[PDB]
Write an enzyme that holds these catalytic residues in place. Structure first.
Site, PDB file in Angstrom:
ATOM      1  N   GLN A 278       6.937  60.993 -61.072  1.00  0.00           N
ATOM      2  CA  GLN A 278       8.275  61.059 -61.764  1.00  0.00           C
ATOM      3  C   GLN A 278       9.320  60.047 -61.108  1.00  0.00           C
ATOM      4  OE1 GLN A 278       8.698  65.324 -60.592  1.00  0.00           O
ATOM      5  NE2 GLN A 278      10.757  64.801 -60.083  1.00  0.00           N
TER       6      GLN A 278
ATOM      7  N   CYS B 183      10.845  66.481 -63.548  1.00  0.00           N
ATOM      8  CA  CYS B 183       9.434  67.419 -63.330  1.00  0.00           C
ATOM      9  C   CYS B 183       9.416  68.336 -64.528  1.00  0.00           C
ATOM     10  CB  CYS B 183       9.946  68.276 -62.027  1.00  0.00           C
ATOM     11  SG  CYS B 183      11.522  68.959 -61.937  1.00  0.00           S
TER      12      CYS B 183
ATOM     13  N   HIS C 162      12.204  73.268 -59.629  1.00  0.00           N
ATOM     14  CA  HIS C 162      11.412  72.439 -59.835  1.00  0.00           C
ATOM     15  C   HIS C 162      10.318  72.986 -60.892  1.00  0.00           C
ATOM     16  CE1 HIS C 162       9.308  68.918 -58.442  1.00  0.00           C
ATOM     17  NE2 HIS C 162       8.157  69.525 -58.353  1.00  0.00           N
TER      18      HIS C 162
ATOM     19  N   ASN D 243       1.606  68.764 -59.696  1.00  0.00           N
ATOM     20  CA  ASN D 243       2.763  68.408 -59.657  1.00  0.00           C
ATOM     21  C   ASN D 243       3.012  67.040 -60.324  1.00  0.00           C
ATOM     22  OD1 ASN D 243       5.589  68.403 -58.539  1.00  0.00           O
ATOM     23  ND2 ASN D 243       4.907  68.437 -56.391  1.00  0.00           N
TER      24      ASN D 243
END
Ligand SMILES: Nc1nc2cc(C(F)(F)F)ccc2n1Cc1ccco1
EC number: 3.4.22.27
Lengths: 222, 220
Positions: free
Chosen positions: A20, A26, A165, A185
């Site tokens: 990102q 995110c 997040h 992630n």
């Protein structure tokens, strides 16, 4: 009866890990990761969906702020209301706020609805991860232990349930009897275990992983 | 004339890299690191000084919020006003807000004054790092590229001059034609190069590194 372990990567339902960069997208990566799995289950095709389409287009009327954060739920709602999302190939990620450039010609997925799981229920999150697919979640990522994580089962006693997040739960298991969630992630392949973190499971909703889970479903493509 | 490269770890002026954990005490680690160097240069003894003493006692009067962040300069002003700071050994880091427990009997250092360097002036920062010692600075650390940094000279196109993280400049140099600041962080040994990051130098105040520099002095 639920499997002791699940890994949707093994079923071909998870795209490459994304980066990102300096844009707080995110939430957009979490949402398109959830929908990517549903597209593979439905069509047999694994296609990266446009996180940028969400950043640029799921904006203020969805409560979202582009590179300054957003909701996975209201991302899914944009995709429903827009009657599609573009492929990542057609609408690539730029790590910045742009004017909306969605084009139905390059629509790669649709969304008919999304399901919100109950607050802090790790038993219910386990069921949805086993039976439905990867689940979009929030974690509290605001800890050096989280962003310097290298390997093993992450456990952080200072972690809170106040999530900040957006990440994707793509499985669960245990490492020598430490239960974990398998989390994708969007910090690139150098973070954690080739972009993944195993986060403590069944330790009192650790880092708020089961605080606000959601997952989309697909009805029609044509 | 200034040296091409400086590293205050070569003069035994820099303590072990500490780990702040989940407490936003970077300002406090930066302030004590700058004072630790002046204490070695004064006494010949390298002593870790109590970041906790700052978190707990350099509070409302200094505009500081313990585990919620603060200012290296107001920390120096607390030490001046308080007429001391305890050793880390006497007043250990707990990574939480506590009541003031300062005790003059465990005082390991004092501060007579602090100097604030002009905004954006990397040339003036280089002079201070060469001639005075390690300098407390703020950087913009809110970039995955920063917390994922492993080696080399960190350069982030997205960096701003809005700083949010206190760190300590302990030197400078040139790696393969990339000028750098040698920066001590307080994220433990698993950040960067055993707790350090080399940050782009002479690239227009990259990540705000020369926005708000300060150093303390000791007279006795
Ligand atoms: N002078 C100064 N020191 C600072 C230290 C920090 C840091 F986060 F790194 F600890 C951030 C801003 C700082 N400023 C600017 C200022 C001027 C009036 C308020 O703040």
């Amino acid at each position: 009866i639920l499997p002791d372990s699940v890994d949707w990567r093994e079923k071909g339902c998870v795209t490459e890990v994304k980066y990102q960069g300096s844009c707080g997208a995110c939430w957009a990566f979490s949402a398109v990761g959830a929908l990517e799995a549903q597209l593979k289950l439905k069509t047999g095709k694994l296609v990266s969906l446009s996180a940028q389409n969400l950043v640029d287009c799921s904006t203020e009327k969805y409560g979202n702020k582009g590179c300054n954060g957003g909701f996975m739920t209201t991302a899914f709602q944009y995709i429903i209301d827009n009657k599609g999302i573009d492929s990542d190939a057609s609408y690539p990620y730029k790590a910045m706020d742009q004017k909306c450039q969605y084009d139905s010609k390059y629509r790669a997925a649709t969304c008919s609805k999304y399901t919100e799981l109950p607050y802090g229920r790790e038993d219910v999150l386990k069921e949805a991860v086993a039976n439905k697919g990867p689940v979009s979640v929030g974690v509290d990522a605001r800890h050096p232990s989280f962003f310097l994580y290298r390997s093993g089962v992450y456990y952080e006693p200072s972690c809170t349930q106040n999530v900040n997040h957006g990440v994707l739960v793509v499985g669960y298991g245990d490492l020598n009897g430490k239960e974990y969630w398998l989390v994708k992630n969007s910090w690139g392949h150098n973070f954690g275990e080739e972009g993944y973190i195993r986060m403590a499971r069944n330790k009192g909703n650790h880092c708020g992983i089961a605080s606000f889970p959601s997952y989309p479903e697909i009805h029609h493509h044509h």
